[PDB]
Structure formats: C-alpha cells, structure tokens
Amino acid sequence: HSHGLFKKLGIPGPTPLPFLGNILSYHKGFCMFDMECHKKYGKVWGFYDGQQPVLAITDPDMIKTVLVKECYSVFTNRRPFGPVGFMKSAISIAEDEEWKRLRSLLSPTFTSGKLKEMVPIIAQYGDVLVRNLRREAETGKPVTLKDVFGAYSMDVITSTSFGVNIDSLNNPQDPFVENTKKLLRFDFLDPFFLSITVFPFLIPILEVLNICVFPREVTNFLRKSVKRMKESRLEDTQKHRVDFLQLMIDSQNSHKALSDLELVAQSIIFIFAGYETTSSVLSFIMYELATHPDVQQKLQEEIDAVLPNKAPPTYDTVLQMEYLDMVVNETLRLFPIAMRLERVCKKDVEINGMFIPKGVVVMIPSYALHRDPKYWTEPEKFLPERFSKKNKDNIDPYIYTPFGSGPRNCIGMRFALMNMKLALIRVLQNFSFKPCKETQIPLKLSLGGLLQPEKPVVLKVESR
Ligand code: HEM
Ligand SMILES: O=C(Nc1cc(C(F)(F)F)ccc1-n1ccnc1)C1CCC1
C-alpha cells in the first residue's frame, strides 16, 4: 500500500513484502539488520515496519538537526508502540505539548544537586552488594551477573524512588520487590509486538478493552502503594525525604500541576527505565573487565588511589575517577542498549538537502554508528583508551549517542552513570572478577529485540 514512498523518493533499501514490510529481516535482531543495511545501502536508507515507513540517517549534521535543531518544531515525538492506557502520561511516551509540560516539571528532580543528596542512599546498597557478593564468592560457585546487579538495581530504585529500604537478594517475595521485578523491558520482536506492528489498527481495540502492555497487577499495586505513602504516611510525618516521589510531591506544592495519576505514571517509568538497564550495563561492564584483566587492574589501581583502604565513595570522588568513566563509556559504545533513536516527522520538512515526508519515523542506528569503521578503529575491540582526555574530543557527540541527544535525551543519564559507577567502585574495591569454564569468551548477543547476551554471563568472584 504505502510501500512505494522510498522508491518514489530515490531512497535505497530492502524490498518490502506485502502486509509485512521488511519485518522478516529481523530474524537476526534490530542491530544486525541495521549493520547490514549500513554496509549495502550507504549513508541514508529506508525500510517498512509493516506499513510504517522508517528512514535511517547516519550523517551527524542530519542527526543533530533531528535531535537538537528541529526537535520542538517537527521531530518532537517517538513512534507509538502499543496499548498504553494511563501510561500515556509518562514522559518517555508523552507527545507534543504535554511532554514539554512534563519535561519542565521533572527536570529539577534530576538536578545534580538532587543526585548528590541521593549518593549516600545508593552507596548504602553498594555495601549491601559486596556482603551478598562475598557469600557468592565464599561459596566458590560461578556468579550470574544479572542477579547480583539486578538486586542492586532493585535496592537503588525502591530507595531513591519511594524510600522502602529493603534488601532484595536475600529478601525476595517482598511486595515491592515481587511486583517491580515484573517491570521487564519490551521485546518488540516478540509475537505480540510483531503482531501489533503488522496490525496497528488493533491497538485501538486493545485500548478500549483496557488491555495494557504494562502488567495491570504491577500498575494497580504501585498506584495504591504510592497512595498509601503519598499522604497516609507522608502528611502525618515531619521527617525529611529525598526520594523521587517526595521531589514530585513537593512539585505539586507550588505550566500546570502534576496530576496524582501523572505522578504515578512517572514513578513507574523511572523504575521501568532504571531496573534492567543498569543491570544489563553493569553486567556488560564486568564482562569486559574480566576478559581484559589489564584494564581491571588499572581501574582497581585508580579506585584505590582516590579512595585509600576501601574508603567510602562520594559524589565528588566518582566524578574524579577518569579511567572509570573511560570503562563505562567504552562499554556503552559496544552495547548501547537502546540500539536506536527514533523521532516521528510531524510535517513535510527538508533538512540538510533531504526531503522527509510527513509521518515517516526517522531512526538513528546507534549500535551501527558505534561500530562503523569510518569513525572507529578496531570497532569490535574493547579499548577504553578511546575516551582518554587526549582522544575523547575527536568523537562526534552525534555518532556516539548512548543516552540520546537533544531536549528528549535521557533525563536520568546522570543518575544512571552515578549509580553504575558507585556499584563498580565498591564491587572492585573488594573483589576481582575472572572468567569461568561456563563463561562465553566470544560473547554472542541475542537475536531478539533486546541488546543482551545470548547465554547469561557468569564469572568467578574472589575476595582481594
Ligand atoms: C541505565 C542506563 C540508561 C541508558 C543507556 C539510557 C538511555 C536512554 C536513551 C537512549 C533514551 C532515548 C533518548 C533519545 O531518544 O534521544 C532515554 C530516554 C529516557 N530515559 Fe534513559 N537510559 C538509562 C537509564 C535511565 C534511568 C535510570 C532513568 C530514570 C531515572 C531514565 C529515564 C529516561 C527518560 C524519562 C527518558 C525519556 C526522556 C524524554 O522523553 O524526554 N533513563 N534513555
Ligand atoms: O527500555 C528501553 N527503553 C524505554 C522504553 C520506555 C517505554 F517505551 F516503554 F515507554 C520507557 C523508558 C525506556 N527507557 C529505558 C532507559 N531509559 C529509558 C530500552 C533499553 C533496553 C530496552
């Protein structure tokens, strides 16, 4: 039907099948498809997700025009992904003016001043992490990274978002833990979302039936859980609070006001954005450290230098360690878990000599651009020196976009980096991580819609 747009514009791309587009080319995942397309179609190419035209762009100037320059005018919203319900008020899903209102009311919550006030909290569960990690080391068994880092992320969110201070690895089946553990990422190549892509006309049907991609058990629990602590346990209390909920509650005190429904929407999305992301990235970081022990030692030397004798990490301490920042950044280059930055074109626009039709999804292949031979040397190699002070200025901010760019970039980039580094400091201060017999030395990525290892990463943990 609409599979004639990219031919009439002279834009190359794979030839679309009726009713399906190039969806069948996702048999090797999102990232492998963009890598191959980049090789055989050049700098700009197009494809169809069902009947949805998608234009991929790789020019840094064009990317900056979409993400930064023309963000408010045209490239304001992302691609709608499915039946959302009340979660349509989340900032990552909001569109047009409501997003601008929500971005304004939530930006002060992510101030670096607020992050510093949350450092003692997430450092508390860094200590909790090594205690439970020492148990897994004294057991002498290969440790699964997703489980220890998952529980650390659980502790961080439940404390920094609501204030429920609870250990998670040794205290499962807790009400908050059991439900928030169900807020798992969306595999957009699974049967449901693949069917949704082929039948986008069924999304209105699912919405009126009150069928939502977010599990209703988790959403209704958290809206009630917020309700019990929003007023029934907060107004009858004069203690100080530092969690995200309190900062959003205080926003309601004095655009417009955050609806109590809107507040629950943002609180859930911060959990959904922060739970498996940190865990996946931290797992990826420990993989590169173990397979390259030279950088693990140098990082352990730098950490022990700034913090002698396992000194408590602090906000100003973390910003000082630059080899830690190099390791984090280089992992995010190899594994940008978003895999893709997408914007929806609200009107006919010509940018950088290219005409973009209305309704086309403009996509930035972050995984492909991070491994392009044009801008990177030995792209498959883990070389943290790329982000050294001497060499970290040759990198274009629009070819390396792990947290996105422009006004719609990750609002929790500082929180994520501070949280992940704080774990890396405490964990490395007390343990050394080495490969196992069960460890996959040539780590293979999944073929689904998530940037995750094929088999779970397992490593050997020894106390220093
Ligand atoms: C842990 C590692 C994380 C990574 C790699 C990451 C990456 C990203 C990326 C690539 C985007 C899209 C930006 C673009 O389209 O230009 C994004 C959006 C967003 N992220 Fe994250 N993110 C992370 C963690 C978090 C956390 C922990 C939070 C919550 C505190 C968060 C909140 C958000 C929000 C709210 C948006 C939407 C921004 C908006 O719509 O204006 N992210 N993130
Ligand atoms: O989960 C992901 N993206 C994402 C999606 C949504 C939404 F579409 F459901 F609304 C909301 C928030 C985020 N998110 C995560 C981190 N920062 C923001 C990717 C990371 C691997 C899968």
From Swiss-Prot:
Membrane topology: Single-pass membrane protein
Induction notes from the record: By drugs, such as rifampicin.
Annotated keywords: Disease variant, Endoplasmic reticulum, Fatty acid metabolism, Heme, Iron, Lipid biosynthesis, Lipid metabolism, Membrane, Metal-binding, Microsome, Monooxygenase, Oxidoreductase, Steroid biosynthesis, Steroid metabolism, Sterol metabolism, Transmembrane, Transmembrane helix, Ubl conjugation
Regulation: Activated by cytochrome b5.
PROSITE patterns per record: CYTOCHROME_P450 (PS00086)
Mutagenesis or variant effect for M413T: In allele CYP3A4*3
Leftover remarks: Chimeric transcripts, characterized by CYP3A43 exon 1 joined at canonical splice sites to distinct sets of CYP3A4 exons, have been detected. All are possibly produced by trans-splicing. The chimeric transcripts exist in 3 different combinations: CYP3A43 exon 1 joined in frame to CYP3A4 exons 2-13, CYP3A43 exon 1 joined in frame to CYP3A4 exons 4-13 and CYP3A43 exon 1 joined in frame to CYP3A4 exon 7-13. The longest chimeric isoform (CYP3A43 exon 1 joined to CYP3A4 exons 2-13) exhibits 6-beta-hydroxylase activity, while a shorter isoform (CYP3A43 exon 1 joined to CYP3A4 exons 4-13) does not.
UniProt protein name: Cytochrome P450 3A4
Protein source organism: Homo sapiens (Human)
Gene: CYP3A4
